[PDB]
Structures are given as C-alpha cells and as structure tokens.
Design a protein around this motif. Structure first.
Motif, short mmCIF file in Angstrom:
data_model
loop_
_atom_site.label_atom_id
_atom_site.label_comp_id
_atom_site.label_asym_id
_atom_site.label_seq_id
_atom_site.Cartn_x
_atom_site.Cartn_y
_atom_site.Cartn_z
N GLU A 296 106.58 13.17 57.47
CA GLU A 296 107.45 14.33 57.36
C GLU A 296 108.59 14.26 58.37
OE1 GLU A 296 103.65 17.02 55.97
OE2 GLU A 296 104.56 17.42 57.93
N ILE A 297 108.26 13.89 59.61
CA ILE A 297 109.29 13.76 60.64
C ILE A 297 110.25 12.63 60.31
CG2 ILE A 297 109.65 13.15 63.08
CD1 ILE A 297 106.84 14.60 63.58
N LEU A 298 109.73 11.51 59.79
CA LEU A 298 110.60 10.39 59.41
C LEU A 298 111.54 10.76 58.28
CD1 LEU A 298 107.90 7.58 59.59
CD2 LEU A 298 110.02 7.59 60.91
N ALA A 299 111.06 11.57 57.33
CA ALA A 299 111.92 12.01 56.24
C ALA A 299 113.00 12.98 56.72
CB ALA A 299 111.08 12.66 55.13
N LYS A 300 112.63 13.89 57.62
CA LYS A 300 113.59 14.87 58.11
C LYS A 300 114.54 14.29 59.15
CE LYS A 300 113.77 19.59 59.99
NZ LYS A 300 113.05 20.52 60.88
N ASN A 301 114.09 13.29 59.91
CA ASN A 301 114.89 12.70 60.99
C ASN A 301 114.89 11.18 60.85
OD1 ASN A 301 115.05 15.33 62.83
ND2 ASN A 301 112.92 15.05 62.17
N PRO A 302 115.62 10.64 59.87
CA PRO A 302 115.62 9.18 59.68
C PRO A 302 116.16 8.39 60.86
CG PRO A 302 117.33 10.23 58.35
CD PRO A 302 116.45 11.33 58.88
N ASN A 303 116.89 9.02 61.77
CA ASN A 303 117.37 8.31 62.95
C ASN A 303 116.40 8.39 64.12
OD1 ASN A 303 119.86 7.57 61.74
ND2 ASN A 303 120.53 9.69 62.00
N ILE A 304 115.18 8.86 63.89
CA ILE A 304 114.25 9.00 65.00
C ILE A 304 113.95 7.62 65.60
CG2 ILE A 304 112.22 8.92 63.49
CD1 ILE A 304 111.21 11.17 65.62
N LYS A 305 113.87 7.57 66.93
CA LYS A 305 113.67 6.30 67.61
C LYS A 305 112.31 6.14 68.26
CE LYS A 305 118.44 4.99 68.18
NZ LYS A 305 119.51 4.42 69.07
N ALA A 306 111.58 7.23 68.49
CA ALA A 306 110.31 7.08 69.19
C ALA A 306 109.44 8.30 68.94
CB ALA A 306 110.54 6.88 70.70
N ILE A 307 108.13 8.08 68.97
CA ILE A 307 107.16 9.15 68.75
C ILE A 307 106.05 9.00 69.78
CG2 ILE A 307 105.54 10.28 67.17
CD1 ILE A 307 107.15 9.08 64.84
N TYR A 308 105.88 10.01 70.62
CA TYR A 308 104.75 10.05 71.54
C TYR A 308 103.62 10.83 70.89
CZ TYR A 308 101.53 11.54 75.03
OH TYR A 308 100.36 11.78 75.72
N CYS A 309 102.40 10.29 70.98
CA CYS A 309 101.24 10.86 70.31
C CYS A 309 100.17 11.21 71.33
CB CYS A 309 100.64 9.89 69.31
SG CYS A 309 101.85 9.28 68.12
N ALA A 310 99.62 12.41 71.22
CA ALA A 310 98.71 12.91 72.25
C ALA A 310 97.35 12.21 72.24
CB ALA A 310 98.51 14.42 72.11
N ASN A 311 97.02 11.43 71.21
CA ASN A 311 95.93 10.47 71.36
C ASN A 311 96.18 9.28 70.44
OD1 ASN A 311 94.89 11.14 68.77
ND2 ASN A 311 92.78 11.45 69.51
N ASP A 312 95.34 8.25 70.62
CA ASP A 312 95.50 6.98 69.91
C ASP A 312 95.12 7.09 68.45
OD1 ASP A 312 96.54 5.42 71.95
OD2 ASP A 312 94.54 4.88 72.71
N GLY B 258 108.72 1.21 56.41
CA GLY B 258 109.44 -0.01 56.69
C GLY B 258 110.12 -0.03 58.05
N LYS B 259 109.55 0.66 59.04
CA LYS B 259 110.24 0.88 60.30
C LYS B 259 109.44 0.37 61.50
CE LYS B 259 113.66 4.31 59.20
NZ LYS B 259 114.32 5.61 59.45
N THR B 260 108.43 -0.47 61.28
CA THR B 260 107.67 -1.03 62.40
C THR B 260 108.62 -1.77 63.34
OG1 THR B 260 105.73 -1.30 60.96
CG2 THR B 260 105.69 -2.45 63.08
N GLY B 261 108.54 -1.45 64.63
CA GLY B 261 109.45 -2.00 65.60
C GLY B 261 110.74 -1.23 65.77
N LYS B 262 111.16 -0.46 64.76
CA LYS B 262 112.38 0.32 64.85
C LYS B 262 112.13 1.73 65.37
CE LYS B 262 113.78 -3.44 63.15
NZ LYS B 262 114.01 -4.53 64.16
N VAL B 263 110.89 2.21 65.28
CA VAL B 263 110.48 3.49 65.85
C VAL B 263 109.39 3.17 66.85
CG1 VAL B 263 109.57 5.80 65.42
CG2 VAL B 263 111.06 4.70 63.69
N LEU B 264 109.61 3.51 68.12
CA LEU B 264 108.56 3.31 69.10
C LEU B 264 107.42 4.26 68.80
CD1 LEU B 264 110.72 3.02 72.34
CD2 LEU B 264 110.15 1.25 70.64
N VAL B 265 106.19 3.79 68.98
CA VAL B 265 105.00 4.61 68.81
C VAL B 265 104.17 4.45 70.07
CG1 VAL B 265 102.93 5.06 67.45
CG2 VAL B 265 105.05 4.40 66.28
#
Length: 280
Positions: free
Chosen positions: A186-202, A216-223
């Motif tokens: 949902e976030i990727l669809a709403k914000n296609p220019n997103i560069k990174a996502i911090y996640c509160a657990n693994d 298709g964005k592995t490496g292009k969006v930090l996780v």
C-alpha cells in the motif's frame, strides 16, 4: 566458589545463549566465578521462580536475573534483597511496584532502550540516503505495544531531525509478516518514490522485503528490521534486507556481571546497552 549467580531465561534460542557467553567472557576478564542458571522448561514462569528460590541457601553476594514475566520473580527477588544480596535486573523490567510492596528492591536494571533501537534503525537509513534524503516509512507493530511504540517514537524522532527526510507513512502491521507485506505494498503504491522503510520487528521486515521484491524494487528501497532474528540476518547477507537492529545480549550480561562485581569492591541504577546494526 562463586560469589555471583545469574538466572537467565531458557537457553533455547541464541539470545540467551549469547548472554550466557557474554557473562562467561566478562567473568574471565574480571577473574570471578559465576554460576549461570536457566530453567529447562521454556516459557514456564514457576519453573524460573523455583530455580531462583533454590539459590536462597547458597551464599551469592550478587544475583542478576532476566525475569520471564514482570511478576514471576518478585517474591524470590524480595527475599534476596532482604538477605542483602546485590540484585541486577536484566532485560525485562521486574514489577517494581509489587517488588517494593514485597519489601524488596534491585540495585540496577540493565536493558536495551527501544526508543534508541528505533532511532538506530532510522539513523542508519538517514546515513544511507546521504545528502539527497528522500521519502521513508515506518511499519509499526501492534498499536500501544510498549516496545513497538518506543521503536516507532525513536525512529520518528530520528527521521524528524533530518530536514530532507520525509516520513510519508507510519502504519501498523501488528507484528504479522503477511500484514506487513500488504501494508508495504500500500505504501509503495501511494509513494512510488519511497526510498526506505524501517520496521519495528524482523518478522514484519521480512514481509516488507517480500512486497519490495514483488514490486521489483529490491535494493532500490532500503528495508531495515529490528531484533536480528536468523532469517533477517540471512536476508541481510542475501541483500533482501538492508539491515536489522539487534540487541546485544552478550553486553547486557557482561554489564550485569560487572555491576555486581563492582558493588562488592534508593532508585536503581539504570544502564542502557546499545543495540548493534546488522549489515552486509
């Protein structure tokens, strides 16, 4: 003979094994004998309480303990405080109100600060995105969860310090891998220019990585995840995740032992042990 004892949780996952090894390494460094106990029955509050109680007749000068619940060690800790034992609470905070009402206290609490955990994950993203900055998101745990809210707060506050970092989404995925995949999509669809996502657990970060891969964005969006569970460590090595923020149980145990040794040579001392970034 051992002046010091430690009561851990069950040695069935690497965190408690690593804490034990860190205590043993610190004992070598300090040149002290320490007895390290854990119950064989995992997830068993009374077994750990009974284990703690079985140390009452030994003559430990200090006991450090990681309680299974905030309640289950209150009575043996109180009895130990009344005998003059130096007490160090590790990891999860004992119910201090009940401990006080039982006539006991502890001298120190050593733990990981979950606000600093979130700030560490967000800060790494901020460094990695460099001068250009960019859009970021937080995938939260269950709303209201103490640890998750602290991680959310720390990441949000850290992102807010960087003027060219825009937090475009902060949304709960309830510690669920499938839900985190959906939320990240949902976030990727709403914000296609997103560069990174911090996640509160693994567990959630691994679902976010799946969403990023599907897009298709592995490496292009930090996780970036949190906890350093083995599958996330593997994902970081494989480039499926950027990093994960892991507690340092070895340092928690080593610090706990050092506090007890130093006591042998009122509000408890509060010691925070920094988390470690797991990267490639």
């Amino acid at each position: 003979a051992a002046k010091y004892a430690v009561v851990l949780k069950t040695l069935t996952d690497p965190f408690w094994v690593n804490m034990k090894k860190g205590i043993e390494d610190e004992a070598k460094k300090l040149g002290v004998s320490v007895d390290i106990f854990a119950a064989a029955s995992e997830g068993d509050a009374e077994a750990q309480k009974s284990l703690f109680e079985s140390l009452s007749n030994k003559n430990y000068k200090g006991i450090a303990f990681a309680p299974l619940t905030k309640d289950n060690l209150v009575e043996p800790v109180a009895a130990a405080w009344k005998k003059g034992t130096y007490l160090v609470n590790l990891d999860e905070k004992i119910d201090m109100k009940k401990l006080k009402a039982a006539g006991g206290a502890v001298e120190a609490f050593v733990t990981t600060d979950n606000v600093q955990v979130g700030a560490q994950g967000a800060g790494y993203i901020v460094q990695k995105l460099g001068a250009q900055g960019g859009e970021v998101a937080i995938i939260e745990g269950e709303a209201g969860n103490a640890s998750g809210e602290a991680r959310r707060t720390g990441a949000t506050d850290q992102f807010a310090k960087a003027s060219n970092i825009k937090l475009v989404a902060s949304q709960p995925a309830d510690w669920d891998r499938t839900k985190a995949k959906q939320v990240a999509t949902e976030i990727l669809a709403k914000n296609p220019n997103i560069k990174a996502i911090y996640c509160a657990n693994d567990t959630m970060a691994l679902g976010v990585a799946d969403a990023v891969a599907d897009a298709g964005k592995t490496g292009k969006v930090l996780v970036v995840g949190t906890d350093g569970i083995p599958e996330a460590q593997e994902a970081v090595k494989a480039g499926k995740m950027t990093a994960t923020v892991a507690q340092n149980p070895a340092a928690i145990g080593a610090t706990g032992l050092k506090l007890m040794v130093d006591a042998e040579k009122k509000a408890p001392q509060y010691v925070l042990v920094a988390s470690k970034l797991v990267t490639a």
